[PDB]
Amino acid sequence: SPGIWQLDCTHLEGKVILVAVHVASGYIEAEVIPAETGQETAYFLLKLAGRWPVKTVHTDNGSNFTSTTVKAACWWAGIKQEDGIPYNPQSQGVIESMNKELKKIIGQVRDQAEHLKTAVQMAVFIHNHKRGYSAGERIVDIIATDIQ
Amino acid sequence: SPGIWQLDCTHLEGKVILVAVHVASGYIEAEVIPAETGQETAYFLLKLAGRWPVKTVHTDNGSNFTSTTVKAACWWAGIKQEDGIPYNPQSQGVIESMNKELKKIIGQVRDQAEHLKTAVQMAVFIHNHKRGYSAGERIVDIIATDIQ
Numbered sequence: 001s002p003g004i005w006q007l008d009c010t011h012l013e014g015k016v017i018l019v020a021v022h023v024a025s026g027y028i029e030a031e032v033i034p035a036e037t038g039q040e041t042a043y044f045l046l047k048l049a050g051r052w053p054v055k056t057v058h059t060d061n062g063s064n065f066t067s068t069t070v071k072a073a074c075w076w077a078g079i080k081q082e083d084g085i086p087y088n089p090q091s092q093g094v095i096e097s098m099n100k101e102l103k104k105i106i107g108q109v110r111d112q113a114e115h116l117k118t119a120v121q122m123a124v125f126i127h128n129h130k131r132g133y134s135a136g137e138r139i140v141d142i143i144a145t146d147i148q
Numbered sequence: 149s150p151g152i153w154q155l156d157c158t159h160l161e162g163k164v165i166l167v168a169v170h171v172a173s174g175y176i177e178a179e180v181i182p183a184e185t186g187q188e189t190a191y192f193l194l195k196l197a198g199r200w201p202v203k204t205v206h207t208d209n210g211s212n213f214t215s216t217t218v219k220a221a222c223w224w225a226g227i228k229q230e231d232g233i234p235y236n237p238q239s240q241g242v243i244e245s246m247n248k249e250l251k252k253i254i255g256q257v258r259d260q261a262e263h264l265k266t267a268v269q270m271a272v273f274i275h276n277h278k279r280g281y282s283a284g285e286r287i288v289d290i291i292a293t294d295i296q
């Protein structure tokens with residue numbers, strides 16, 4: 001499980017927030033995009049895989065799972081693309097709860113940022129630093145233990 | 149040492165590539181921006197600090213060092229902003245060499261990507277995965293050892 005990530009797309013202010021969650025740690029990366037297209041998802045995955053050792057991605061929906069551009073990016077970056085079907089039904093609740101939590105943080109900082117994208121990055125920061133360990137600490141520890 | 153990053157701005161195709169290098173490992177994150185402004189640099193730092201434990205940033209030039217927006221982002225994210233003066237003159241050579249290396253990789257992939265930003269992210273990927281260890285492996289190991 002150190003290489004497993006889950007995609008998650010949520011909506012706010014008529015805009016789209018694309019999230020990748022490292023399942024074992026709760027660590028996230030996120031971006032605001034005008035709309036969830038295969039192209040945007042593919043580009044997001046290329047960025048992610050250059051930054052962390054992404055082995056497997058559970059895609060957020062069937063359109064992205066089918067997308068030729070997403071498939072191309074997964075091929076390029078050496079990522080195994082899988083479905084995101086919650087065979088364990090606690091999987092959707094966890095993601096649902098994270099989206100609510102992220103939106104709450106966005107509301108708390110929204111005043112400090114002119115643009116939503118900035119607020120989202122503040123939320124990523126707060127989420128990954130929140131402490132017992134933080135998600136940032138957990139992902140580093142998990143990956144370091146795997147490398148050895 | 150584990151928390152020290154250096155900013156680096158290089159140019160290609162009439163565009164600007166902003167790079168953050170984790171000094172101890174050689175690990176990088178990068179983005180294409182239309183121009184180096186304080187605003188763009190500030191946003192880039194907010195993203196970086198949400199993703200890695202950034203303690204100190206050596207800024208790439210005096211404009212960014214002076215920028216009130218950059219100072220605001222460093223305050224927000226708990227980053228100590230420092231100059232990027234190469235007191236050890238081997239510092240410039242290393243960065244110079246990395247920019248040449250990154251541009252070479254961009255040329256090698258440029259054909260596989262319609263847009264420069266995509267080529268840059270491919271270059272980040274190749275740079276961080278290149279093997280002995282990779283930069284990705286070194287940064288994780290360095291930070292994990294520090295956490296303990």
Ligand SMILES: CC(C)C[C@H](CNC(=O)Cc1c[nH]c2ccccc12)Cc1ccc2c(c1C(=O)O)OCO2
Binds near residue numbers: 220224
């Ligand atoms: C570090 C943070 C505390 C401040 C900076 C600067 N912003 C302000 O001073 C607040 C502000 C300016 N007008 C407003 C209007 C309404 C509410 C708040 C504001 C945030 C920032 C940094 C870089 C960026 C940004 C932003 C952003 O504001 O979205 O947008 C893209 O590149």
Ligand SMILES: CC(C)C[C@H](CNC(=O)Cc1c[nH]c2ccccc12)Cc1ccc2c(c1C(=O)O)OCO2
Binds near residue numbers: 267
């Ligand atoms: C994963 C990679 C091997 C392919 C994809 C798709 N690109 C192609 O099929 C090549 C291609 C299409 N027109 C061209 C014109 C000239 C040269 C190459 C091409 C790259 C990609 C993914 C996501 C994105 C992108 C890009 C991008 O091309 O920049 O732009 C922003 O979001």
